[PDB]
Amino acid sequence: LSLIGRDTELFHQDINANEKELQSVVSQSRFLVLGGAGSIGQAVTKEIFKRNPQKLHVVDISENNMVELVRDIRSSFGYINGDFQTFALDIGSIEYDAFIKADGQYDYVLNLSALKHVRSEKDPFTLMRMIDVNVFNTDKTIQQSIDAGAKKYFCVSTDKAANPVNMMGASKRIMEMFLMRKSEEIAISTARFANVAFSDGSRIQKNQPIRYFVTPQESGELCLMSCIFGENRDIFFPKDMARFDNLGIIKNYQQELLELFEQKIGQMKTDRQWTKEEIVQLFFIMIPDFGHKETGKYLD
Amino acid sequence: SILSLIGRDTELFHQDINANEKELQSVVSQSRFLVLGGAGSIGQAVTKEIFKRNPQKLHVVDISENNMVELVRDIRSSFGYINGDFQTFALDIGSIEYDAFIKADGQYDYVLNLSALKHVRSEKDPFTLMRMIDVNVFNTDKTIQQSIDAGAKKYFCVSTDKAANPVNMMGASKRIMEMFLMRKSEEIAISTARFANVAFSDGSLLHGFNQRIQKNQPIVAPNDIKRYFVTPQESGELCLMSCIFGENRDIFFPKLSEALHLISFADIAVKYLKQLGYEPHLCESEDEARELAKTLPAQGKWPCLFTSSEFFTDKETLDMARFDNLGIIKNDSLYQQELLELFEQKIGQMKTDRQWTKEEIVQLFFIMIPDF
Numbered sequence A: 001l002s003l004i005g006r007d008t009e010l011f012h013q014d015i016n017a018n019e020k021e022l023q024s025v026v027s028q029s030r031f032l033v034l035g036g037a038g039s040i041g042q043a044v045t046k047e048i049f050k051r052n053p054q055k056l057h058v059v060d061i062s063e064n065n066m067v068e069l070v071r072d073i074r075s076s077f078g079y080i081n082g083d084f085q086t087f088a089l090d091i092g093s094i095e096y097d098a099f100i101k102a103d104g105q106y107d108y109v110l111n112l113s114a115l116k117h118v119r120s121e122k123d124p125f126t127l128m129r130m131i132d133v134n135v136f137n138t139d140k141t142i143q144q145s146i147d148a149g150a151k152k153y154f155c156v157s158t159d160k161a162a163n164p165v166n167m168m169g170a171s172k173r174i175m176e177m178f179l180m181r182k183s184e185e186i187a188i189s190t191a192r193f194a195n196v197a198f199s200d201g202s203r204i205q206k207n208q209p210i211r212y213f214v215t216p217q218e219s220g221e222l223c224l225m226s227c228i229f230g231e232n233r234d235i236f237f238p239k240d241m242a243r244f245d246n247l248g249i250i251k252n253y254q255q256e257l258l259e260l261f262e263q264k265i266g267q268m269k270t271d272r273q274w275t276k277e278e279i280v281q282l283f284f285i286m287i288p289d290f291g292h293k294e295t296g297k298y299l300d
Numbered sequence B: 001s002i003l004s005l006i007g008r009d010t011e012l013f014h015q016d017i018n019a020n021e022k023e024l025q026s027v028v029s030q031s032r033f034l035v036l037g038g039a040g041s042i043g044q045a046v047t048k049e050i051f052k053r054n055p056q057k058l059h060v061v062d063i064s065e066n067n068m069v070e071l072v073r074d075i076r077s078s079f080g081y082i083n084g085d086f087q088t089f090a091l092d093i094g095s096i097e098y099d100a101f102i103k104a105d106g107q108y109d110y111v112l113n114l115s116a117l118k119h120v121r122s123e124k125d126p127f128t129l130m131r132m133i134d135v136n137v138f139n140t141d142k143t144i145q146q147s148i149d150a151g152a153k154k155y156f157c158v159s160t161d162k163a164a165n166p167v168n169m170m171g172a173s174k175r176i177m178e179m180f181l182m183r184k185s186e187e188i189a190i191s192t193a194r195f196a197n198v199a200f201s202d203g204s205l206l207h208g209f210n211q212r213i214q215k216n217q218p219i220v221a222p223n224d225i226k227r228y229f230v231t232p233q234e235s236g237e238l239c240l241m242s243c244i245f246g247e248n249r250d251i252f253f254p255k256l257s258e259a260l261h262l263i264s265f266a267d268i269a270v271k272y273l274k275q276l277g278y279e280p281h282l283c284e285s286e287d288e289a290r291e292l293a294k295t296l297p298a299q300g301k302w303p304c305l306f307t308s309s310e311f312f313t314d315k316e317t318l319d320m321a322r323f324d325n326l327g328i329i330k331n332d333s334l335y336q337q338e339l340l341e342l343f344e345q346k347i348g349q350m351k352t353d354r355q356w357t358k359e360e361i362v363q364l365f366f367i368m369i370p371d372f
């Protein structure tokens, strides 16, 4: 916070003016946080936890990082009287589906799960996984939230207003299209942001050599602010410019493109083979001005 | 530095490694390797052991894209680059994606599986427990079958931490895995390792000490639990030795040398705080500790809360002659076809029903392992 060089909170004024309702609403509410052991997900979870939630379940595929989340929560805040549980699960698995079928009762579902790295686009196999995790897992969990009568689904929008340049952004833009179809049935709000300092994946232990930033805690409050107070299709961002002081709001598909997407990806999976180029060609149909190029190819 | 923390000053396998270095280098340079769970704590270590000996082919697979980035950065600064086929893939071994990766390629000489769910608490609920069964039993059995299908010469994976009966579902899962492994070992050479505590491995109490220090939080550690500790590199060296030199069914493990001492977790914390330039302050309360953590680190003290509450049995066939530093158990565990089929049938049906209870799994585990 001072490590990135700043005096104060970005949202000093905004959470202040709403703290009591934030407190109020969290007290009487039930929360499912997907990807909750990730860098943004740990901060969102910690923001829900310190406000005394009635129910807070955290799901994340990383068994190790979840353990740390918990350790961190115990030291920071101690213990809470609501029902706080954690589950080291893959959101796309039968185990997660069983989890939901056995309970599934939440008011707010927040999804900070993702594959986000450029490594992950280099090969058709991880690229397919990125699609599963960023697009289809998001679509399925929104459906599950709808079927449970959740009030609100939060997720993290693309990082940029404009056109994706890589496969990760493209996957986020495609995810958004599936969101738009779902927003006919449940309120959906997103957060658009950039550069949470010290995020996972962003040397001294191993004696090896070694812009604007926001803190992890600031990223958790925004997601929370959008979750609780965001209207359907709202995208909250860090600064409708009149509702809040440091928070902005972007007020925000083709059925046949979505169908074509599910069909093509579906067939590739059935065939049990596909090339990166197949997927890239499909993306270009999905996103018209997709400014992906073959200049990466010439980079070693 | 890790060594000095675990009350030792010299590597464990310096003699066995040095004695076999030339042959290690010959083998690695003409062989293809697949490391599953290779972004994990032992995974990375064995991946580095392979990489530095200039392998023909080395493919790393793990669900953590973040820890993979760390593995590659570490490899780049430690060793640089090789001519051979080094690639990483952030894939879940249970997935269509991973199966399509194997169908397209799968051509490896040596397949190493350091993937797992390992936290005892992953027993809490029936959903995490089912995942642990999928990751520790079924993924292992499948990747072995995929290795037989591609003509791999050797599959390596981890053994149960102890020779004694399991006491929790974790150990039972690894014990059930071993039954599946024994069946597969009638078709391909399989060898394993049994490890001491690997110092600072991800998710461990020790790894926790780093986090606590980084987050200005109290250190918490049992003062009444002692363990043997090894370094990450030592874990990696043991994997590679069992991999390259293990015979079908050999369990490699570190001999208790005169250097290896039992040390308590509290004792490691104190050593570790002093190496960081801090003096431990013994607190007698969580609440106290939390408050003292805000101001004490400034004045070079750290609040501490110190709490309290065999690699081989005697009927195991050993080879203690082959290596100086490494012991070999000649595993002769058995399986019954019918109990393996039962387990696959009953687990498959729980998955079909989309519902199951913890106690249903426990009951199946009692049939699989009667003395559990």
Ligand SMILES: NC(=O)c1ccc[n+]([C@@H]2O[C@H](COP(=O)([O-])OP(=O)(O)OC[C@H]3O[C@@H](n4cnc5c(N)ncnc54)[C@H](O)[C@@H]3O)[C@@H](O)[C@H]2O)c1
Binding pocket: A034, A035, A036, A037, A038, A039, A040, A041, A059, A060, A061, A062, A065, A089, A090, A091, A092, A112, A113, A114, A115, A116, A133, A137, A156, A159, A193, A194, A195, A196, A197, A199, A200, A201, B066
């Ligand atoms: N950190 C930043 O500065 C930043 C900036 C812009 C956008 N974002 C976006 O915010 C989101 C989170 O970013 P992050 O920095 O927190 O990423 P992260 O890697 O730190 O956390 C992602 C989490 O998702 C989990 N996950 C992946 N697949 C899963 C699955 N199948 N089931 C359950 N969990 C799964 C991972 O274990 C990880 O904990 C991402 O979409 C990222 O693109 C982050």
Ligand SMILES: NC(=O)c1ccc[n+]([C@@H]2O[C@H](COP(=O)([O-])OP(=O)(O)OC[C@H]3O[C@@H](n4cnc5c(N)ncnc54)[C@H](O)[C@@H]3O)[C@@H](O)[C@H]2O)c1
Binding pocket: A064, B036, B037, B038, B039, B040, B041, B042, B043, B061, B062, B063, B064, B067, B091, B092, B093, B094, B114, B115, B116, B117, B118, B135, B139, B158, B161, B194, B195, B196, B197, B198, B199, B201, B202, B203
């Ligand atoms: N660390 C120790 O002290 C220790 C001691 C004795 C035995 N062991 C055993 O050694 C093995 C590894 O220990 P570790 O300390 O390196 O654990 P670890 O948690 O650091 O690493 C396990 C790795 O497996 C990966 N993984 C899990 N599921 C996967 C999947 N479905 N697909 C792809 N990757 C997957 C994880 O992301 C992780 O990188 C485990 O069986 C453990 O029980 C460890």
Ligand code: NA
Binding pocket: B030, B031, B032
């Ligand atoms: Na060869």
Ligand code: NA
Binding pocket: B103, B104, B105
């Ligand atoms: Na092929």
Ligand code: NA
Binding pocket: B107, B150, B151
């Ligand atoms: Na071949």
